[PDB]
Amino acid sequence: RAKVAMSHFEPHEYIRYDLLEKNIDIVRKRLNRPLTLSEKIVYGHLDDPANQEIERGKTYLRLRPDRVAMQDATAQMAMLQFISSGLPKVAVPSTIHCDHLIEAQLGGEKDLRRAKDINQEVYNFLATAGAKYGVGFWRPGSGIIHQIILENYAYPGVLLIGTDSHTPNGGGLGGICIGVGGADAVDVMAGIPWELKCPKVIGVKLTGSLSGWTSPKDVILKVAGILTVKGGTGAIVEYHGPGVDSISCTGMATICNMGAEIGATTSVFPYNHRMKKYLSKTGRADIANLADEFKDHLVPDSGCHYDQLIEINLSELKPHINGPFTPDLAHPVAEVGSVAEKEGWPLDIRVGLIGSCTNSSYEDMGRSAAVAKQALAHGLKCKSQFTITPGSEQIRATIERDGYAQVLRDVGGIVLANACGPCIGQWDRKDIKKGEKNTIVTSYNRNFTGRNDANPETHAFVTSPEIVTALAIAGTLKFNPETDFLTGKDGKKFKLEAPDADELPRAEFDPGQDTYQHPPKDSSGQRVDVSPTSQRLQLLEPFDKWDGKDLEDLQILIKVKGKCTTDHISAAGPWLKFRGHLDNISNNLLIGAINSENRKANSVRNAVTQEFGPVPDTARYYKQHGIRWVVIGDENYGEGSSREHSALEPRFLGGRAIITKSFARIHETNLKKQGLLPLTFADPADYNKIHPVDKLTIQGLKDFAPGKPLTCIIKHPNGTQETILLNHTFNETQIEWFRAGSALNRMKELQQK
Ligand SMILES: O=C([O-])/C=C(\CC(=O)[O-])C(=O)[O-]
Ligand code: SF4
Numbered sequence: 001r002a003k004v005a006m007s008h009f010e011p012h013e014y015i016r017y018d019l020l021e022k023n024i025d026i027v028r029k030r031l032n033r034p035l036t037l038s039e040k041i042v043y044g045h046l047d048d049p050a051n052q053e054i055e056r057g058k059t060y061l062r063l064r065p066d067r068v069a070m071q072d073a074t075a076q077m078a079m080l081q082f083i084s085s086g087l088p089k090v091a092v093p094s095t096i097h098c099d100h101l102i103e104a105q106l107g108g109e110k111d112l113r114r115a116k117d118i119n120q121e122v123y124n125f126l127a128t129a130g131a132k133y134g135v136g137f138w139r140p141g142s143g144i145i146h147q148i149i150l151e152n153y154a155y156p157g158v159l160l161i162g163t164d165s166h167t168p169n170g171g172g173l174g175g176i177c178i179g180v181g182g183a184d185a186v187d188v189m190a191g192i193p194w195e196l197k198c199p200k201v202i203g204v205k206l207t208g209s210l211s212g213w214t215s216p217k218d219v220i221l222k223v224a225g226i227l228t229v230k231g232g233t234g235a236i237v238e239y240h241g242p243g244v245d246s247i248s249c250t251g252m253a254t255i256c257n258m259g260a261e262i263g264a265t266t267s268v269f270p271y272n273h274r275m276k277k278y279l280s281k282t283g284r285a286d287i288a289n290l291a292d293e294f295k296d297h298l299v300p301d302s303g304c305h306y307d308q309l310i311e312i313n314l315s316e317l318k319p320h321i322n323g324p325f326t327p328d329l330a331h332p333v334a335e336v337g338s339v340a341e342k343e344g345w346p347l348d349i350r351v352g353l354i355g356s357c358t359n360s361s362y363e364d365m366g367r368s369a370a371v372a373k374q375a376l377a378h379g380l381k382c383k384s385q386f387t388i389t390p391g392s393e394q395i396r397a398t399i400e401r402d403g404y405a406q407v408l409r410d411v412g413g414i415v416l417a418n419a420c421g422p423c424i425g426q427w428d429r430k431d432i433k434k435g436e437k438n439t440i441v442t443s444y445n446r447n448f449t450g451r452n453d454a455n456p457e458t459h460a461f462v463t464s465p466e467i468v469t470a471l472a473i474a475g476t477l478k479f480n481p482e483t484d485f486l487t488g489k490d491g492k493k494f495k496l497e498a499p500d501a502d503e504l505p506r507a508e509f510d511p512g513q514d515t516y517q518h519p520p521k522d523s524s525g526q527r528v529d530v531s532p533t534s535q536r537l538q539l540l541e542p543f544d545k546w547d548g549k550d551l552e553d554l555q556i557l558i559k560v561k562g563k564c565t566t567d568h569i570s571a572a573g574p575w576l577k578f579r580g581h582l583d584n585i586s587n588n589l590l591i592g593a594i595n596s597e598n599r600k601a602n603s604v605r606n607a608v609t610q611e612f613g614p615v616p617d618t619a620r621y622y623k624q625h626g627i628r629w630v631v632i633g634d635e636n637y638g639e640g641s642s643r644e645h646s647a648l649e650p651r652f653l654g655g656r657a658i659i660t661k662s663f664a665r666i667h668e669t670n671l672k673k674q675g676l677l678p679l680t681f682a683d684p685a686d687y688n689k690i691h692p693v694d695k696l697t698i699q700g701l702k703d704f705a706p707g708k709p710l711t712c713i714i715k716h717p718n719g720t721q722e723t724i725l726l727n728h729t730f731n732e733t734q735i736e737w738f739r740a741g742s743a744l745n746r747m748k749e750l751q752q753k
Contacts, residue, residue: 102419
């Protein structure tokens with residue numbers, strides 16, 4: 001067919017739209033109905049299109065992704081599991097991005113130099129493991145994973161998996177890009193079929209066009225408020241309608257990115273002329289030309305069925321700001337000043353932060369510079385502190401060149417390194433004390449308790465970068481940029497003009513400094529060294545195989561009340577230092593979860609000593625004494641980040657099962673991957689029948705089967721017992737992971753030894 005390479009770094013890896021077409025056509029002959037766009041790309045990547053059972057929301061699809069991307073806070077454990085498999089080389093194009101371990105303190109170059117000294121052991125491990133197993137390496141300073149992917153790797157029709165829940169960002173260039181845990185990435189790098197529960201499809205029809213202060217970010221802030229954080233679970237969100245051509249390609253990536261906050265499997269836009277334009281401006285005109293020839297397979301079929309349809313008229317959409325502790329609490333910017341006042345949320349904004357993968361594009365930076373130049377023209381600078389994170393080295397070099405970085409410095413901003421930084425709590429924040437109630441506003445995406453600065457009382461609101469800039473200049477939530485007046489230096493009141501800026505550079509992008517390191521695919525004689533006394537890295541010891549017995553008289557480690565995110569189960573911020581060291585990071589296990597017994601975080605009753613203490617310590621005490629334990633959770637357990645450490649840590653400290661009213665998708669898969677039993681109540685009211693003092697027996701593991709519930713005997717201390725049923729979503733592939741002790745143990749059994 002055409003021999004068009006998948007990226008500039010892999011000249012020999014060709015795009016296979018011929019394969020996609022062939023597979024779409026086998027499947028539509030079977031289904032005889034219109035296919036949505038997500039169905040075309042997902043069913044087009046089936047391992048066996050002729051025999052795969054395809055029912056939305058019910059069957060597990062065996063898929064073949066085109067490539068794997070990893071960022072350095074999850075790559076360490078994905079590669080330590082890959083190193084246990086014993087396989088010599090990755091089977092598909094794979095990259096590591098070093099973006100999560102650079103702490104914001106001094107700004108830009110200074111923080112990057114310091115991170116390279118501090119994290120030398122880890123950057124060394126990842127570069128060497130990358131060279132040995134054939135994984136491309138983007139050096140510290142290169143940029144945030146998802147901006148590097150949109151710029152270099154995402155193309156229409158790709159199926160890409162990434163070990164980061166915001167990998168959906170690539171849906172802005174028409175690909176299916178899905179967040180997974182490190183063990184799922186190992187399947188694909190190992191060459192075995194990846195499984196995904198067949199998604200439902202929510203369609204969002206966009207009408208009208210964006211005007212003025214409304215930006216692409218307001219579309220997904222509104223959609224999150226509508227669907228809530230659990231409304232997208234098990235579905236792909238597919239944007240369509242006449243309003244789509246109104247949105248820039250990075251704008252589409254912003255909307256797909258934050259669909260992670262409603263729990264969606266991913267989000268996608270149809271191939272169109274804005275994407276074509278972006279591909280051509282990023283050196284990939286040949287890929288846009290090939291996608292023009294396969295265009296029919298890159299847009300939805302006429303008359304396809306969505307399981308839910310939502311319509312948003314872009315012309316009536318107004319600026320939004322969401323939070324403070326969930327991203328689906330949505331307020332128009334016009335009313336947040338008055339809701340804050342009523343709810344006792346701090347009105348004064350201490351810090352305004354723009355960037356992150358969600359909103360660090362050239363257009364985002366130009367729109368923020370457009371607000372800032374107006375303030376400068378009246379002799380004002382920011383009242384709040386103001387930070388700017390460029391998404392990649394190319395964007396930093398180009399906004400520097402086109403003058404936007406200097407405008408942002410002149411209003412009072414500090415340009416941080418091209419890294420997550422304050423977004424995952426890598427921020428040496430010193431302006432407030434811990435426990436001090438305060439407000440920050442960001443153009444990020446999640447705003448969960450203590451995530452940006454480890455202070456549980458920081459109230460963080462997420463909005464668009466131009467609204468963060470406008471509010472940073474005013475310094476208060478009681479300021480609506482559309483209606484209110486500022487007072488210049490000269491004494492005149494003035495109003496901010498709605499920002500307008502170019503979506504892409506008129507000239508070409510300036511690539512900035514060299515940061516990609518290609519694997520030697522010759523040599524590969526790298527020894528990966530992990531010192532046995534390292535505090536940051538530790539080789540894995542395999543978990544135990546199942547003993548063949550039912551789980552009786554399980555102790556409840558903690559019955560959690562309410563929202564329990566993976567930042568509650570395994571915090572980030574300072575704990576990122578231990579992401580390659582399982583025993584050391586297990587000391588944060590569940591320290592953020594609220595215990596229903598006393599309403600406290602990190603205080604559970606040790607059943608033997610009758611002392612209340614830290615959750616990690618209690619779990620290690622139970623494990624020392626052979627007491628097997630369980631966690632009882634509420635709705636949407638495991639919401640958020642994909643970090644598989646929230647599943648590896650309970651397995652390591654002797655946990656056996658997590659029984660909840662419902663699970664978020666990626667955490668439930670990670671639990672099964674590590675040999676734990678994620679189970680849900682067949683009747684969610686049974687959560688109220690279990691008290692922290694009860695012992696539980698899970699029976700029926702011997703005839704464990706897809707679709708058959710397990711019986712749980714609740715043993716009350718007074719001698720009463722109650723039997724309840726627990727459902728599970730295991731298929732026979734997954735039951736084999738459980739019986740072997742973990743998916744990696746099963747994979748190693750299949751290696752004939
Ligand atoms: O490295 C991580 O902890 C996983 C992240 C970053 C985050 O929480 O934003 C994710 O999957 O989203
Ligand atoms: S959401 Fe924040 S922490 Fe996660 S990849 Fe994006 S910039 Fe990094």
